[PDB]
């Protein structure tokens, strides 16, 4: 029988300019709604959204993944590991209303791409063609990673996303963005002083800050710094593992290398489980608002 194959189907009559306008719609609302989450902005939660909708993928049977856009259903919407992402969906809802032709998958992942670039991150190539799928295609809860584990768990988990050691260290650098909320995850605090601008701070702070394993007000254990930063047990497991450590030091001294590696691994994350036809358009690279004179 062979498992499902999700073929990229371009939105009828839409091209680069059309998707550029969706980009600008997302990028503009990012500026207007700049007071969200104590002026952190909707940036971080939008890339967390794109990661959680792509992180449901299973390489063994091509179930989950961002193709179906099945996060629009309650079963995935109310996943305990997806607490706080409602702000992200609510953010994109007027944008979906303005562009009703775009699929949920394409919109969610584009939100991911858009805010990284708008937060002065690397350019991330993005491909349209995702198609909505019925409610029965919505994957069960528990496919998203656990925060209270070690290096062995992380490496093993990301095997299901076809990610290697170099791929997961670069992706994890996104944890320099935003913060953990106690009422969402059971963890509290930012990972650095700059959490709405895309940098390599996650790797620097992981090597240069002194961390002490404590117990927060939710009785959970997290690594805290004297500066007031926090790291999840999985985050800290990157400098505990000798192979992960080497890559951490690499991205710490070379943000350029980090950017190019993140751009690769992030796109691959959003496109996992998608078959792009031979006739499919080459990946889009949207110019930023700053590159549009704004």
């Amino acid at each position: 029988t062979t498992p499902l194959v999700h073929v990229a189907s371009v939105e009828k009559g839409r091209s680069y300019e059309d998707f550029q306008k969706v980009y600008n719609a997302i990028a503009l609302k990012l500026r207007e709604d700049d007071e969200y989450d104590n002026y952190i902005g909707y940036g971080p939660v939008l890339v967390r959204l794109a990661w959680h909708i792509s992180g449901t993928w299973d390489k063994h049977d091509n179930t989950g993944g961002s193709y179906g856009g099945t996060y629009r259903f309650k079963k995935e919407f109310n996943d305990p590991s997806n607490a706080g992402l409602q702000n992200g969906f609510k953010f994109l809802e007027p944008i979906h209303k303005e562009f009703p032709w775009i699929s949920s998958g394409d919109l969610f992942s584009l939100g991911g791409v858009t805010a990284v670039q708008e937060m002065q991150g690397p350019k991330i190539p993005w491909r349209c063609g995702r198609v909505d799928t019925p409610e029965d295609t919505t994957p069960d809860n528990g496919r998203l990673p656990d925060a209270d584990k070690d290096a062995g768990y992380v490496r093993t988990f990301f095997q299901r996303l076809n990610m290697n050691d170099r791929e997961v260290v670069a992706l994890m650098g996104a944890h320099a963005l935003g913060k953990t909320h106690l009422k969402n995850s059971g963890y509290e605090g930012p990972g650095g002083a700059a959490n709405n601008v895309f940098t390599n701070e996650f790797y620097l702070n992981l090597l240069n800050e002194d961390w002490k394993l404590e117990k927060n007000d939710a009785n959970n254990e997290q690594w805290d710094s004297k500066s007031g930063y926090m790291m999840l047990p999985t985050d800290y497991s990157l400098i505990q593992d000798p192979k992960y450590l080497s890559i951490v030091k690499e991205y710490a001294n070379d943000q350029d290398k980090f950017f190019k590696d993140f751009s690769k691994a992030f796109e691959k994350l959003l496109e996992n489980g998608i078959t792009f036809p031979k006739d499919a358009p080459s990946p889009f690279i949207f110019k930023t608002l700053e590159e549009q004179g704004l």
Partner: protein
């Protein structure tokens, strides 16, 4: 000056959220990620001792006032190329007016 005036109360909440993580303002304020901003007005860029600036910040040598600060806080890296201040920018004129109003009081 094209800088009008804002709310020092709004600016206070704007500084504690978007500036405080890297900047102190009181006298004897400790050098953190960014330098202490006490008496930043009436002083050229990159001249507070104890802090390690970039070469571009020093060579800019701009006499800080409410106006050139507005340019800088709008887009930090365009006004001064090569700066290490990782900041998106105050893209709203009100937030600029509000914060500069607060800073002026705090930098006293």
């Amino acid at each position: 000056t094209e800088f009008k005036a804002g709310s020092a109360k709004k600016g206070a909440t704007l500084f504690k959220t978007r500036c405080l993580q890297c900047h102190t303002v009181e006298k004897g304020g400790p050098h953190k990620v960014g330098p202490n901003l006490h008496g930043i007005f009436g002083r050229h860029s990159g001249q507070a001792e104890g802090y390690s600036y970039t070469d571009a910040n020093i060579k800019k040598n701009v006499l800080w006032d409410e106006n050139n600060m507005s340019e800088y806080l709008t887009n930090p890296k365009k006004y001064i190329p090569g700066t290490k201040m990782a900041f998106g920018g105050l893209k709203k004129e009100k937030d600029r007016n509000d914060l500069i109003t607060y800073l002026k009081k705090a930098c006293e």
